[PDB]
Structures are given as C-alpha cells and as structure tokens.
Amino acid sequence: EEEMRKLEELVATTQAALEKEEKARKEVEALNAKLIQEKTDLLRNLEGEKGSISSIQEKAA
Amino acid sequence: EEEMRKLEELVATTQAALEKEEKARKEVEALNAKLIQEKTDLLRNLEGEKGSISSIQEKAA
C-alpha cells in the first residue's frame, strides 16, 4: 500500500524543480545586462557635460 | 534495494537544483538593492545642472 506514494512524490519533485531553474537562469543576465548598458551611454554624456560647464566659466573670465 | 535506488538519484539532482536556485536569486537581489538609487540621484544631478545651463546662456548671450 506504500509503493505507489513514493513514485508520485518522485515525479513531483522533478517537474517542480525544472520550472524553477530556467526561470532563475533567465533573469540573472536579463536584469544585469540592461543595467550595465544604461550607465555607459549616460557616463560619456556626463563627463562631456562636466567639461562643458567649465567652458562657460573660462570663456566668461 | 532497487526501489530506494530510483528514489535517491533524482533527489540528488533536486538537492543540487535547490542550492543553485537560491544561489542565483541572492546575488541578483543585492545588485538591484543599491543600483536603482544610483539612477535616481543622478537624474537630480543632471537636471539641476541642465536647468542652469539653459539659464546661464541667456544672460551670457
């Protein structure tokens, strides 16, 4: 009466784990890669504008 | 015993699955924990500057 219950718990632990791995393996680079590109285009906009604010200071003196 | 042999192999993959499941999530929560504040205060940094750049040029012209 006990041989049936270990087989249904056997297939349940594998299908529940299998949907959990590839859900996590997808989102780790999905969040990281779109965050590292959006700082790179803003930083060259930043230091080029920080060079532009001193230009109005040297031209006025 | 052969019936306990079929039980223990896929659980060994599942115990290897759960440790890799928690490994991916705890590194992706800590990187988002400080970086979303990084994009907010630079927005005040840029707009507080470019609002002045629109204001410094009209009296310099």
Using a CB-CB cut-off of 8 Å, the residues of chain A touching B39 are 38-39
Break chain B down into helix, strand, coil percent, rounded to 5: 95, 0, 5
The tokens for A60 are 């006025």
Chain A to chain B, count of Cβ pairs less than 8 Å apart? 57
The distance from CA B2 to its chain's CA centroid, rounded to whole angstroms, is 45
* Nearest-CB residue to A21 (from B21, B27, B38): B21
* Experimental approach taken: cryo-EM
Which residues lie below 8 Å from residue A25, measured CB to CB, with a gap of 6+? B24
Only one residue has tokens 């997808």, namely: A26
Q: Report resolution (Å) to 1 decimal.
A: 4.2
The tokens for B1 are 């015993």
Reported in sequence order, the residue ranges of B3-56 that DSSP labels E, i.e. its strands, are: none
Do residue B28 and residue A25 have CB atoms under 8 angstroms apart?
no
